[PDB]
Design a protein around this ligand. Sequence first.
Ligand SMILES: CCCCCCCC/C=C/CCCCCCCC(=O)O[C@@H](COC(=O)CCCCCCCCCCCCCCC)COP(=O)([O-])OCC[N+](C)(C)C
Ligand SMILES: CCCCCCCC/C=C/CCCCCCCC(=O)O[C@@H](COC(=O)CCCCCCCCCCCCCCC)COP(=O)([O-])OCC[N+](C)(C)C
Ligand SMILES: CC(C)CCC[C@@H](C)[C@H]1CC[C@H]2[C@@H]3CC=C4C[C@@H](O)CC[C@]4(C)[C@H]3CC[C@]12C
Ligand SMILES: CC(C)CCC[C@@H](C)[C@H]1CC[C@H]2[C@@H]3CC=C4C[C@@H](O)CC[C@]4(C)[C@H]3CC[C@]12C
Ligand SMILES: CC(C)CCC[C@@H](C)[C@H]1CC[C@H]2[C@@H]3CC=C4C[C@@H](O)CC[C@]4(C)[C@H]3CC[C@]12C
Ligand SMILES: O=S1(=O)NCN(C2CC2)c2ccc(F)cc21
Ligand SMILES: O=S1(=O)NCN(C2CC2)c2ccc(F)cc21
Ligand SMILES: O=S1(=O)NCN(C2CC2)c2ccc(F)cc21
Ligand SMILES: O=S1(=O)NCN(C2CC2)c2ccc(F)cc21
Ligand SMILES: [Cl-]
Ligand SMILES: [Cl-]
Ligand code: NA
Ligand code: NA
Ligand code: NA
Ligand code: NA
Ligand code: NA
Ligand code: NA
Lengths: 446, 446, 446, 446
Amino acid sequence: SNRSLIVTTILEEPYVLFKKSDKPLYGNDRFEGYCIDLLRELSTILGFTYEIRLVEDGKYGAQDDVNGQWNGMVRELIDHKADLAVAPLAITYVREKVIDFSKPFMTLGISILYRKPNGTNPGVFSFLNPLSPDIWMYVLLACLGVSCVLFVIARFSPYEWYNPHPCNPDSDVVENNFTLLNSFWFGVGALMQQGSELMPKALSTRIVGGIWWFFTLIIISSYTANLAAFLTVERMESPIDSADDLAKQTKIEYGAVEDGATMTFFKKSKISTYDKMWAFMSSRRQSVLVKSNEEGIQRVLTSDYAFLMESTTIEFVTQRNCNLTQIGGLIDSKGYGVGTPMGSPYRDKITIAILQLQEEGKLHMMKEKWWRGNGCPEEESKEASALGVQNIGGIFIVLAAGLVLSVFVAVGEFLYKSKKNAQLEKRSFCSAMVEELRMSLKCQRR
Amino acid sequence: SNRSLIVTTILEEPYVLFKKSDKPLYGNDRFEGYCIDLLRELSTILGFTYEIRLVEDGKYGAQDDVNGQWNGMVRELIDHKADLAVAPLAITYVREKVIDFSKPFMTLGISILYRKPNGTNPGVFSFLNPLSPDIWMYVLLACLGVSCVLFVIARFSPYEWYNPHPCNPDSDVVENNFTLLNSFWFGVGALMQQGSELMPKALSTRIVGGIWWFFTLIIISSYTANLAAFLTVERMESPIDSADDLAKQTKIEYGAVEDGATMTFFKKSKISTYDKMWAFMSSRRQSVLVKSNEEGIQRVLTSDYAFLMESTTIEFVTQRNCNLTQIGGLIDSKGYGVGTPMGSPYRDKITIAILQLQEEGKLHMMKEKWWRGNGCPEEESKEASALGVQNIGGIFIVLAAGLVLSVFVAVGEFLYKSKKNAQLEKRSFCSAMVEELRMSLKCQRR
Amino acid sequence: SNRSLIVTTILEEPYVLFKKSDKPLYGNDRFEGYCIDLLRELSTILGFTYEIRLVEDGKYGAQDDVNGQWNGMVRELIDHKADLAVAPLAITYVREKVIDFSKPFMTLGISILYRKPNGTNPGVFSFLNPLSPDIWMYVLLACLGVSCVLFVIARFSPYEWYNPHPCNPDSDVVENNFTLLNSFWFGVGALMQQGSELMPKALSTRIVGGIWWFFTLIIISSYTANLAAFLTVERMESPIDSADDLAKQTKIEYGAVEDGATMTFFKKSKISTYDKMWAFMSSRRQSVLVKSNEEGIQRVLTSDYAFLMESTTIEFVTQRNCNLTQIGGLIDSKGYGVGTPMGSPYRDKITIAILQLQEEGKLHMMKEKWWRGNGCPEEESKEASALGVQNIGGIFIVLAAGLVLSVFVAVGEFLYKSKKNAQLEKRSFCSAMVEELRMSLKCQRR
Amino acid sequence: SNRSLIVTTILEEPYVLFKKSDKPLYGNDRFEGYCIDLLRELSTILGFTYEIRLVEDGKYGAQDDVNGQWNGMVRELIDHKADLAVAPLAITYVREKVIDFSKPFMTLGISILYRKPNGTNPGVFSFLNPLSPDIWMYVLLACLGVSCVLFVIARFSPYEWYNPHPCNPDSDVVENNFTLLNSFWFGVGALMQQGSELMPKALSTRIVGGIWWFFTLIIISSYTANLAAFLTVERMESPIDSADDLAKQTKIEYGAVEDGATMTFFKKSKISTYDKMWAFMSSRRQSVLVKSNEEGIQRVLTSDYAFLMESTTIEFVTQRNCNLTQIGGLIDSKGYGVGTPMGSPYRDKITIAILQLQEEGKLHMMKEKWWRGNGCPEEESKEASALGVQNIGGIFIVLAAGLVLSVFVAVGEFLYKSKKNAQLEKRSFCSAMVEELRMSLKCQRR
Ligand SMILES: CCCCCCCC/C=C/CCCCCCCC(=O)O[C@@H](COC(=O)CCCCCCCCCCCCCCC)COP(=O)([O-])OCC[N+](C)(C)C
Ligand SMILES: CCCCCCCC/C=C/CCCCCCCC(=O)O[C@@H](COC(=O)CCCCCCCCCCCCCCC)COP(=O)([O-])OCC[N+](C)(C)C
Ligand SMILES: CC(C)CCC[C@@H](C)[C@H]1CC[C@H]2[C@@H]3CC=C4C[C@@H](O)CC[C@]4(C)[C@H]3CC[C@]12C
Ligand SMILES: CC(C)CCC[C@@H](C)[C@H]1CC[C@H]2[C@@H]3CC=C4C[C@@H](O)CC[C@]4(C)[C@H]3CC[C@]12C
Ligand SMILES: CC(C)CCC[C@@H](C)[C@H]1CC[C@H]2[C@@H]3CC=C4C[C@@H](O)CC[C@]4(C)[C@H]3CC[C@]12C
Ligand SMILES: O=S1(=O)NCN(C2CC2)c2ccc(F)cc21
Ligand SMILES: O=S1(=O)NCN(C2CC2)c2ccc(F)cc21
Ligand SMILES: O=S1(=O)NCN(C2CC2)c2ccc(F)cc21
Ligand SMILES: O=S1(=O)NCN(C2CC2)c2ccc(F)cc21
Ligand SMILES: [Cl-]
Ligand SMILES: [Cl-]
Ligand code: NA
Ligand code: NA
Ligand code: NA
Ligand code: NA
Ligand code: NA
Ligand code: NA
C-alpha cells in the first residue's frame, strides 16, 4: 500500500460529471459517470487509491507546433504530476509516441447526425401512391383501348343498329348510339363508378361492357385497400442512407467541428468519396464548419443539416432527444485508452484488468447504464390523424385544372359551330353576334 | 385453566378496528376486524382466554442498525412481554431469526394499483373525423363551384341545345336541361355516388362531369380508407396489463412508499424488468416515492400515477372505489403469520388450528366478510367492438334535420304555386283550398 | 460432518425426472429437475449429503382408514428410514399432525384447464357483426320512415305533378310517379348503391333524396371500414371466464380426478357456487370423473370439457401445449413444504434456508428455468386467410330465402289479377286458364 | 542488420493463402493475403527481414487443462521459437497473461449469419385471394341462378306486361323487357355495382332485384375489407433484424460451432436475451451446434438455420454469396493483434507502426482489397409498397381475354344475321358483301 494515485480527468457527459446534490465539497464523491464506475472496478482488481483531480486547462492535449509544447491531460502525464488519465482520451499516433495507452475500453468512430424522418409533408399529391405509376398509365391505355374496340364492335355488329323513336313504329330510320365520342364516355363513366346514359345491347358489345366492369371493380377495390394499408402502417424513410448518399446531394449540407479530430480525417483522406466531402467544407467554411458539438446539434435540429461527430456522442444524444437519428454505419475506427506515463508499469496491469471485465461482461453493463435514456421507440399503433390539405389537395389542383380546360373547349365548340352557321351567313362576326344573344334571352326555349 | 394470554396487535384496517359505538369502558370489546375474528376462532378450539393490547407505537418491527435492537410487535415478543401477535406481520427472513411464526393464514404479494380506464366518450358526430374540418368545407365549396361552372358552360355551348321532343321530329324548338337547379342536382348526385337523370352531351360539359367524377372517387376512397385506419388502430390499443407494460412506458409514471417492504424488493432485484423500474424511481425519488399508502392512493386518482403496494390493500380499496382497479398478477410472494416468542409451545398448536380452519373454509369466509363491501355497479360492457348508437349516432340527427327542412320547403312550394295560381283567377285562399282537394284524389289524376 | 441424509422423493415432471443420456447408473446424478436444484442450494446454505432415494411405493401418503396405516413418502418419515422429503408434498391438516413441514417453497391452488379459443366457426352469419343490432334495426326504420315522408311530400308538392308523354304536348294529363310502392323502391335502391328508374324533381323532394344519399354513404363506408378492422385484428374470447361462469352452463362439462385432492375440496365445500359444482359430479360419475391427470388433459384436448387440477400443473402443461389455456384465477390455496420427521431439528433450519433464497430471488429463477417452454404467443400480425363459407354464407341463406318469398308474391299477384279479370268473366277458373296460356305463347307481343 | 525474424501464421483465408501458381521452390513467396500485406508494410517502416513459417498444427492457441501447457501459435511465442504472430489471433484475457499483444489492427465481434430473404413471388392473379375458390364459384352460380329465376318470375307475373309505346296511348300491345338475355344483363350489371337500363316494376320482381342488391353489397364490401387485411398485415411483417428478434422465435433455429469462442460467450453471459439463446442451444446440442464454419454456412443455405460466428467471416462470405446477408449489429467486441513473447522489445514499435498505418488509411485500403470480391448484383428494389404489375397484373389478362372473346361473338352476330338475311332474298355471300358496305357508311344511316 504505497501513496495514492493522481488521476487526471476532464468533464464530459456521460463520462465524468458532478453529482446533483446539496452539502457541497464532498471530496472524491463529487463525481460520477462512466469513467468513475470504470475506476471503481480498477481499484477492485488492482489495489490503489484516488484524489481524482481535474485538469487545470480543460483540454485533452495537442501540439503547439512552434514551442513543442503539450497541453491538456497529456502534459500532466509527461511531467509526472498525475498517474492515470481515465477519460475519453483517444489513442492517436502522435500521443502514443510521447505517452503510453492501455488497450481500449471503448471503440468508436465517425458517423452522421441527421433529423429523424417525420411524415409531415408527403406532398400535396400522393393520394396517388398506392398504385405504381405503370398501373396509372396502363389504365389510361386500357380505357382508351376498350373505347376504341367498343366503337369497332358496335359498328360491325348488326344487332346494335336499332330502330329509334318507338313512338312511330314501322319507319326506315336506323341509328347507332355508339359514336366515337360516346364510346369514350362509356369507358370513362364506367371507370368512375357512375354509369352513362347509353347501355350496350347486342351481346358482343355486352361482353365488352361486362368485362370492363369487372376490370373497374378490382382496380378501385385495390386502390381503397392499399390506401388503407398506407394509412394504418406508416413506414417512413430517410433521404440519405450513408456517406456516399450524402456525397451526391447538394440540398442537405455537411458539417463538422472546425479544427477537431473529425475535420482532420476528411482533410487527410484520399478516398474519392471522402475527398469530395472535403471539397465542400473547404469551400463553404464559416457556414457549415461549426465550432462546438453543442452548437452543431442545434443546426441539425433547426436547419436542414447533417453533422459529423464521434459515434459515442451520437449514441448518447439520440437517446436523449427523439428528433434525432444516426445515419449509416461508422467511417473511422478509434479507441479510448487509459493514459499512462511512458515507462510506467501500470500500463500492462490495467490491460490485464480491462480484459478481465470484458470477459465478465461488465463494460457492456456500465455502458448500458450511462447511455440508455428514455429510448422513445413509442411502440404505438400509429396514431391516425385526420386527412388534410397536406395529404390530399392535388385533387383540388386537378379539379381547377379540368375546369380551366373545359372553358377552352367551350370556346372551341362555340367557334366551330359559328363557323358552320357562317357558312350559310356572312364571314365570321355575324354568327358571333347571333349566337351570344340566344343565351342572353335567359329563357328555356329557342 | 392458566393465565390469560397477552396478544399484541396494530391499528391497520380491516385487521383491528375500534368498534364505532357509544357506551365506553369496554375490555377487549373495543376491537373488531379480521384478526379479531381469527383470534376468536383460535381461542375456541385451543381453549385459552386472551387480552388484546395495542403495542406502543404503530410499528410492526424493524432492526435499528445503530442500536442493534428491535421495535414494535417483534420487540414485545422477543422480550416475552406478549406471546401472540395476531396482525399483518409478514414472514420475513430477518424476522424469522428472532421470533417464531406459524404457517401462514393469508397469502399475498406485490401488485400494481392504477385507475380504471374512464373510457372513450366517442363524441357522436364521430363519423366526421377521417377528414379535416377544412376538407369538409372545401368539398362543400367545390360542389357549389363546379355547379356554377357547369351552369355557365352548358348554357354558352351550342352542342347542349338539342332538339326536345324527338318523338315529333323536324320541329323547331331547342331546350337546355342544365338549369340552375338541375346543375346543383348533377353535382350532388355525382358526389354521393348516385346518378342523376341528366347527362352532359357536349364535350365541354363532359370535361366538367368527367373531372368531378374523378374528384369524388378519390374523396370517398380516402374517407373509407382513413376510417378503416381509425378503427384498426383502436383495436390494436391494448391497455396496460403487466409490470413489463409499465417498463416500456414513460408517460405513466411509477410510485411506491419510501423505505417500505415494496421499495426494498426493487433495490435487491436482479430481474431486468424490475431493474428498469428501480432505474426510473431512483432518478425521481422526490416526486414519485410517496410517503404513505393514503397519499399514494390519492395520487392514483388525481394524476396519471401507478402505485406499487401489497395485494391485500389493493383488493380492499378496489372493492370500495370503482374508479380504481388492479393491473396484473402478483410480483412478490409472501404471507402473514401469527407471531410467537422463539421456542414457544404455540407455533405448532396454532399451525394445527390454522390448517383446521382452512380445511373447513373459515379463512375464506372471514376474508369475504371483511374485504367485500357494497358490491360494485361495474357493468362491464367494455368489449364494445361493433359500431353503435354512441359511435355513428349523428347521421340520424342530420337525417331528421333534413326531413324537417324539406317539409318547410314543401309548404313554400305549395304557397308559391298557389299565389301564382291566385294571380290570374282566384284571390288569395280559395285557390289554396281547391289545391288540397286535387292532392287528396286517390289516383294519378289532377 | 455426520452421516449422509436419506432424501425420499417421488418422480414428477418438472420436479424430479431422469436425465436423458447414455452410460447408465450414474448414482446421485441420475436425477434433475426443480427439487434437485432446490436440494443443491440447501446443501450450500446448510451442510449435508445425499443418497437421494426413490420411494418404493410411488405414492405420496394417505390414510388406510381401517388399519391406521400410512403410505407413500410420509410412511418413510414416520419410521425413520428417510430424513428429508423434498418433493411436491402438500401441507395438509392430516399430514402436519403426524410429520413436520417447513415453510412453503411454492404456492398453488385449484384452477381450470380448457381449450384455447380458436375462431374457426364464427357462425354462417356474422358478416353482420360490424354494426350493432340496434343499428341494423334503425336503418330499416329509417328506410321505412323516409319512404313514407317521400310519399307525403311528393303528393303535397305542386312541382312534382308534371305532364307525362312529351311526344304529345298541350294535353290535360298530369301524373305523379311517386306512388307508395315506388317510394319504398327509391329508398331501397338508394340504400343498396344502385339507383332506381325514377328520380325526384321538385326541390322539396330532392332534399329528401339528397339527405338519404348522404345517410347511405356513411353507413356503407362505416360497414366496410369496421369489417376491415375485424379481419385485420382478430380478437378472440372464451365462453367461460371463471368458476361461476362454469357453474351455470351445461354445454361445457366439469371434471376432476376421482379420489384426489381436488375432488375432496368440492365434496367438503359449503360455498353455493362450489356446492352446485359437486351436484354435477356426484350425478355424472364415470363420465366426467377421470382417473389420472394424463387422461384428463386428453378429454379437454379432444372433447368439449373443462378439467380441474392443481395450478402448478396447469402452468406447466400450458407452456408445452398451445391448444390449452387457464381459465380464471385460483380457487384453493395450498403450499408445497419439505417433509421432515416429527421432532427433527432440520425443520427450522430449512425454514431459514428457504426464506434466504426467496429474498435473493432464486426460487423465482428456478421456477422460470423449469416451467417456461417455447411459450407460443406467436406475436404475428394475424395471418389473413381467404374468406369462406364459414365466414360468409348467411347471405347465401337469405338469397335463397328471398327467392322463395318472391315465388309466393308472384302467385299472389297472379290470383289478384285473375280475380279482377274474372270480375268481367266467369267465377274463378276461367281466367286461370286464360292467363297461363299467354306465357306459353313464348312470344314477345300479346 | 541482425538475424531475420521468425513469424508464425495460420492457414485461414483471406489472411494467409498459398499463391495459386506453377514453378515451385519459393521462399516466403508461397504466401499471400491480408496478414502478408500487413507484415510487408511493418517491415518497410521498422526495417527487418522476416521468414514466414506455418506453425505445426492449424491451432491458434488454447490451454489444455490436463497438461497445463499451451499449443499452437501461443506455444511458439512462449517458448521463444518465434517472435511474431501475424494472424487472426484474438486478444483474450487468458492469452494476455502469457504473451504480449500489440494494439489491435482489426476490430470485430459476434454477429448473426442468415439467408437473404428470397422475396414474395406474389403470383399474378393475386387479386383473387381475399375470397375462397368456392366463394368465387358460388357467386358465379348465384348470378346464373337468380337470372333464371328472374326470367321465370317476370314472365308469369301479369304486372310486368306493361304497355309499350306510351307515346301512342290506347293501343293494344304488351311487351316484356325481361327476355333471357336481358335477365343475365340485369344480374351482371347489379353484381358489378353498375346499373342496367331496365328495372323491375312488379313487386315479385322487385323482391328478386332487391335481395340480389343486398347480396352484392355484402360481397363487394367483404372483398374490399378482406383485401385491406391482406395488405395491412404484410406491411406489419417486419424481417428479423436483431438477436432479440431471434429470442422470441422458435421457428428459425440458432446454431454455433461447438467449443469455440462464440459458444463460450453465451455460456458466461448474464444478459437475459442471450441466456435464452443458450437455453435453446444447450437443449438441442446435437443438431444445431455444428462442427465447423464450413458446415454451418451450408446449413444456412439448405435449412431455416441462423448461424453465430465472428463478424469478419460474415463480412467475407456475404461479399461472395448474395444469397446470404448479415442481420444485426455486433454482440461482442474484440480485436486482432500481432503476438510477441512476453517482454519483447517489439510490442511498442509495432504499436507505433499500426497507428501510423491507421492515420494513413492503409489498414482500410488493405481490408477493401481482400474482403470485397466481385460486387453484388444486389439491386434493392425491396421497398415495393405500391401495387404494381407483379401484384394485380392478371386483371389485364382477363381483360384482354375478354376483348378477344367478344370479337368472335361479333363475327357470329355478323354471320347469323346475314344468313337470316340471305334466307329471304340473297343466296349466301352477296348479302354479306353489301352488309360490310352499310357499316362502312360514315354516318348514322343504314
Ligand atoms: C382507382 C383510380 C381509377 C381511375 C383512374 C383515372 C386516371 C388517373 C390517371 C393518373 C395518371 C397519373 C400518373 C402519375 C404517377 C406518378 C406519380 C408522380 O410522379 O407524382 C409526382 C409529380 O407530381 C405530379 O405532377 C402528379 C402526377 C400527375 C398529376 C397530373 C395529372 C392528374 C392525373 C389524373 C388525371 C385526371 C383526369 C383523368 C380522369 C378523367 C409528385 O408525387 P410526390 O409523391 O409528391 O413526389 C414523389 C414522386 N414519386 C412518388 C414518384 C417518387
Ligand atoms: C351496410 C348495409 C346497408 C343495407 C342494410 C339493409 C338491411 C339489413 C337488415 C339487417 C337486419 C338483421 C339484424 C340482426 C342482428 C343480430 C345478429 C344476430 O343475432 O344473428 C344471429 C342470429 O342468426 C340469424 O338469424 C341472423 C340474423 C337475421 C338474419 C335474417 C334476416 C337477414 C337480414 C338482412 C335482410 C335482407 C333483406 C333486406 C334488404 C333487401 C347469428 O349471428 P352469430 O354471429 O352467428 O351468433 C352470435 C349472435 N350475436 C352476435 C348477436 C351474439
Ligand atoms: C378540339 C376541340 C377544340 C374541338 C372539337 C370539336 C368536337 C368535339 C365537336 C365538333 C363537331 C361535333 C359533332 C357535330 C354533330 C353531332 C351530331 C349530334 O347529333 C350529336 C353531337 C355531334 C356528334 C357533335 C359531337 C361533338 C363534335 C365532334
Ligand atoms: C301481398 C301480395 C301477395 C299481393 C299484393 C298485390 C300488389 C303488390 C299489387 C296488386 C295491385 C297492383 C297495382 C295495380 C295497378 C297498377 C297500375 C300500374 O300502372 C302500375 C302498377 C300498379 C300500381 C300495381 C302495383 C302492384 C299492386 C299494388
Ligand atoms: C355468337 C354465337 C356463338 C351465339 C349465337 C348468336 C347470338 C349472339 C344471337 C343469335 C340469336 C340472337 C337474338 C335473336 C332475336 C333477338 C330479338 C331482338 O328483338 C333483339 C335481339 C335478339 C334477342 C338477338 C340477340 C342476339 C342473338 C342471341
Ligand atoms: O488505436 S487502436 O488501439 N489501433 C488502431 N485501430 C484499428 C483500426 C483497427 C483501433 C480500432 C479500434 C479501437 F478501439 C482501437 C484501435
Ligand atoms: O414466508 S413463506 O411461508 N415461505 C416463502 N414463500 C414462498 C414463495 C416461496 C411464501 C409464499 C406465500 C406465503 F403465504 C408464505 C410464504
Ligand atoms: O398450508 S399453509 O402453510 N397454511 C394455510 N394456507 C392459507 C390460506 C392461507 C397456505 C396458503 C399458501 C401456502 F403456500 C401455504 C399455506
Ligand atoms: O482486446 S481490446 O484491446 N480491449 C477490450 N475491447 C473492448 C470493448 C472494450 C476491445 C474491443 C475491440 C478491439 F479491437 C480490441 C479490444
Ligand atoms: Cl412452520
Ligand atoms: Cl498495449
Ligand atoms: Na508508447
Ligand atoms: Na424461527
Ligand atoms: Na407438526
Ligand atoms: Na501481457
Ligand atoms: Na377499406
Ligand atoms: Na386496415
